[PDB]
RNA sequence: GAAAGAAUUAAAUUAAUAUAAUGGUAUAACUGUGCGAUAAUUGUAACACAAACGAGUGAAACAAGUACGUAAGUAUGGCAUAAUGAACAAAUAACACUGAUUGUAAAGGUUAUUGAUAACGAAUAAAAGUUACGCUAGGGAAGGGUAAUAUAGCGAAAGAGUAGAUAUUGUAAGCUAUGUUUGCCACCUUCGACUCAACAUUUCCUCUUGGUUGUAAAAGCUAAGAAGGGUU
RNA sequence: AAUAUUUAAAAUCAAAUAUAUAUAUAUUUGUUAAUAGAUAAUAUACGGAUCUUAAUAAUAAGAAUUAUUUAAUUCCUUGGAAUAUUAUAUUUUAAAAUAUAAAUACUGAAUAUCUAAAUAUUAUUAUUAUAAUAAUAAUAAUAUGGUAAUAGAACAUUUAAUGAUAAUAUAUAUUAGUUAUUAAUUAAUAUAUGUAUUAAUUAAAUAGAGAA
RNA sequence: UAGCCUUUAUAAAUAAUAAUUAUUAUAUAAUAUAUUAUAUAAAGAAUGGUACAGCAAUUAAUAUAUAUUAGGGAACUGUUUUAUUAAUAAUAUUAAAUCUCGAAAUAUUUAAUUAUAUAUAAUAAAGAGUCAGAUUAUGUGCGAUAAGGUAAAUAAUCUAAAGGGAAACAGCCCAGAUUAAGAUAUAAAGUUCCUAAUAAAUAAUAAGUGAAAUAAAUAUUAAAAU
RNA sequence: AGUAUGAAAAUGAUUAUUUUAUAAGCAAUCAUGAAUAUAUUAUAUUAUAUUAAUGAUGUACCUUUUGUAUAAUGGGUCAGCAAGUAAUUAAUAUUAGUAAAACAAUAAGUUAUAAAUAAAUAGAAUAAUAUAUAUAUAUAAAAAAAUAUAUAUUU
């Protein structure tokens, strides 16, 4: 290994920052595209824009990417995940069987939530 | 009502497959604006790439000529003929 | 209440399958038996699997004939996947297609079959070595990485040490450090002697110190600080 | 207090969230630190400086390390309100009261938008003279890195055909300007020629050299 | 030759890409134990045998004052028993590239619908170049769970890619250069000075540990819970 | 190796302007003072041109390579020269001429106009779109497989 790939095995304090903010993103995203759902099908019974969004029944999802999407268990929003798997992740080659979130290829992208129980 | 989907991200590094979802969406470059009518089928593909774009719920849609006339600054001046 | 029949359910594919292994098989593809020896036949074969080409695999359907079955129907070899070889040149037979002036013929043609290129897409019918006396066009089509090995340390202590594992010694296994030996990868195509040495300390001597029923003294063993000077 | 174990959110406890909703179910989150061990050869090597705070005392410092967070802190649920704060103006006695500003932290690319320009294409217009056309200019949208390679269009030099003008010109060279500029032009200067195979359309190349 | 690229066109062309509905169940209402609509839950039409999980059959391993057969000495005194050992039976516990009784996500893939039409497929006529690859991440064969090693599989980048960040850096994080400008957002990364940019909250460190390449078994000290 | 001209470059000496004797690397780009020279509209608080104050950025070019500043190959410099050309054929694409014909005319030839079969004496709706017809295998003839032909004007 003499080719210097000199990436750091623990964050910087910004790095977890902006980290926090993407996990946040694509939170919204998420929350975003279930509101749209649920005020198209109010329209389609009739209701109008307005009281569609002050409505108290809240239609939720019936897709199933989306319904496990918005389960807590299987995608964890920021303020629900740990902070050992906001920053980092499970392999299975390493001590501890954790490394750093950034060695993943793409992680800014990627988007990895949930670890093994008891790993 | 409408979706406002932004292409935040770019995708350099995202693979092919990411990619096609993308381009069926009509998203272009990084930061291209689309409005998308809410549906089943347009949630399902947004949910793919629901990291590379930024979905807001919106009223209306806004044409591009729209867009255009709204993204125009405003120039500090009126011409007077001579 | 009893006898017989049709049988049902559970288990079974571990036995058996011509032949390796895998998949399948009791609704049997396994076994027994009658007829049979027939489809182990004949001209068109669409469409698919596979696929660079050459090739390879399954096969609906139309037409002629055969075997079995009362009939429905089954049979274009083997439960399936291996059991193979292109052209060229020759050989045998059939067709009646050409027949170099005409008639024959000779010769070619279509159809069916034959022989091995095992370096198995087979360069010829037919071919081994030596060169340090060598030549031409090209490519590299000690440093670096690793540390099995080697050196050294650390943890635990089986056992010696007259007694007591830890004064000294420390099996075999464990965790490490160096890149000083033998290796491995191919990114990168001279051993010794003379002269002068510079640097490190994992200290051979000189300086200070701890332990040594195994420090009585002197010589010694082990260890810590120490690279100023010296080391045929 | 002494002794013996582990360092755990699995179980238990606490808190948050979704459903039936004063409770119950379900989901999620929360369980040690320092030192020694510590190791070689040109030269200390976090990139370097350097970084741990201190009352008397400064308009003023007190990690620039590790862990979890915020964008001044708190309630409702990105946004609203209140409360510790800095700065200023007015009034009153260096202090008190009222009023205003700050709640997006900032840097950051050849990213995106805006501001202009060029080419191509799709769709609409305008001016001028296969007019269903050509040239030019507008508006909206999309595209414009690139080796091997493919396709389109142009420029320089020379030759051949046609081909006015002329020392108040032509050719060449230097300098300074112009045109979105490998080119051609304006002016000045210098030298040759009573003078372009000149502009432009074709046809051909001994048609372009830091690479052997 | 195929694979990947290019030029020109053809319509009776959307056939391309992407996702959704499909399925099971519960609750409410309508209709005749069933159908329909609405809401909710479930890794949600069809194919599969990896991870995981397990010891089913196959291949292996361990232990039983458990039982039986046989072997051997002693006791009994030739009997049975005992001392036992191997095998089987019973119970309990384990693992495997060529085991999967259970079983994911990804994946293969289907009709209709919707969205991409300044967009895809298919087809016809003509041209190439390439057939020495490299690194990173993941799951493996060989090696020794060694190599900037070797061979393949998936994704990205370099090859052929400017720019920002990692001091320097082909392969890492961002982000793709028509030409301008420079107002505004910014990505990765940063804000004491070198160097463009900062103020805070709660705990720990006293070792300059650390501060952009974490060095292990173990020993000491101290802190929480039982 | 003709004769004239010759401010073509490389190369040498000298002079003129500017910079340089406390500062370190493809010698340039950008930012920016200062000095100097020209300027017949510097009206100037002016415009250009030259110049190593000072600051930031900056790892020569080509070839071969997965990969080069590479301590991999080639280059002292400048000028001239130095590499996809021709002949005879074939196939495709655009345009032009003519057109069920075209070239060429003296004849001859070539191509197209009929598809097949190894080949032969065979060769396209008996009444309409393939269900008809021609050829090849087969037959008495059909079916079957492959290609081609036809719905005022022959392509
Ligand atoms: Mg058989
Ligand atoms: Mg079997
Ligand atoms: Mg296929
Ligand atoms: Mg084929
Ligand atoms: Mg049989
Ligand atoms: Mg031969
Ligand atoms: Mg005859
Ligand atoms: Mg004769
Ligand atoms: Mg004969
Ligand atoms: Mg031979
Ligand atoms: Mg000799
Ligand atoms: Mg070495
Ligand atoms: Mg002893
Ligand atoms: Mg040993
Ligand atoms: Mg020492
Ligand atoms: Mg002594
Ligand atoms: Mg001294
Ligand atoms: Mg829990
Ligand atoms: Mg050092
Ligand atoms: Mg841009
Ligand atoms: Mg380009
Ligand atoms: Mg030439
Ligand atoms: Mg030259
Ligand atoms: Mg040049
Ligand atoms: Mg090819
Ligand atoms: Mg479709
Ligand atoms: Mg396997
Ligand atoms: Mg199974
Ligand atoms: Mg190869
Ligand atoms: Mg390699
Ligand atoms: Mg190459
Ligand atoms: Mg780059
Ligand atoms: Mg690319
Ligand atoms: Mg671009
Ligand atoms: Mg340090
Ligand atoms: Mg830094
Ligand atoms: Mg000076
Ligand atoms: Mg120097
Ligand atoms: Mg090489
Ligand atoms: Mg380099
Ligand atoms: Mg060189
Ligand atoms: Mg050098
Ligand atoms: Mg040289």
Partial sequence: ???????????????KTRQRERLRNVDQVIKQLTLGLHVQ??????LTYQEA????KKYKPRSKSLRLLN????????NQMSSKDKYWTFDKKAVGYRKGIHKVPKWTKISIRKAPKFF | VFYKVTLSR??????HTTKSIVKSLGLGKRGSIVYKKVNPAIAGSLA??????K????????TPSQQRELRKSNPGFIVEKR
């Fill in chain 1, 1 to 15: 290994g003499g080719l210097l790939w000199k990436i750091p095995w623990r964050m910087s304090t910004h790095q």
């Fill in chain 1, 41 to 46: 099908r109010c329209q389609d019974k009739g």
């Fill in chain 1, 53 to 56: 969004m002050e409505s108290k």
């Fill in chain 1, 71 to 78: 389960k807590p268990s299987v995608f964890p929003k920021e």
């Fill in chain 2, 10 to 15: 770019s995708l350099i590094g995202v693979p």
């Fill in chain 2, 48 to 53: 793919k790439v629901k990291e590379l774009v």
């Fill in chain 2, 55 to 62: 979905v807001e719920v919106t009223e209306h849609e806004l």
